[PDB]
Amino acid sequence: MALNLQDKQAIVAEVSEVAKGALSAVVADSRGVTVDKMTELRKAGREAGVYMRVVRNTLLRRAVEGTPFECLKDAFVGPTLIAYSMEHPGAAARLFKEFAKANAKFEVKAAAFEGELIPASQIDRLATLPTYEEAIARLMATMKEASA
């Protein structure tokens, strides 16, 4: 490994994603294959490319060293194996969705999805999301309200 001069970058970089981010998910990759990463990188791909991460770090000692910053709801995620996912642009989006759909294709556990932060809380798969731009679901709420 590297000394501190390197354990600091994995911090100053990874914590300015939290400081400058959008949504957060969860997942434990016990059996995390590489067809695994391959896929989810195309997903990050659709979800821009390299706007996304997953930098395995669940050393509390790392991606909690980014938490007493923001998201101190994660002192509780960080135990055991974890795969932290941050969003920069994009809706508070679909990121959420396929992690459940992925891991529900066996694709290993999902930490039961211990969940995360947009609010400041816990678990439950939501597509309360990428409807986003479904302001059309407030366009159809126009003419249909005007007519009916």
Binding site: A135, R138, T142, A146
Partner: peptide
Amino acid sequence: SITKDQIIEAVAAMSVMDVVELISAMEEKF
């Protein structure tokens, strides 16, 4: 209110205008 006076603007408008707007149209009614 005037329905045409709220269609001419309600088909043509910006973006982030809406993004910090229709996370809340859901609130007054629904």
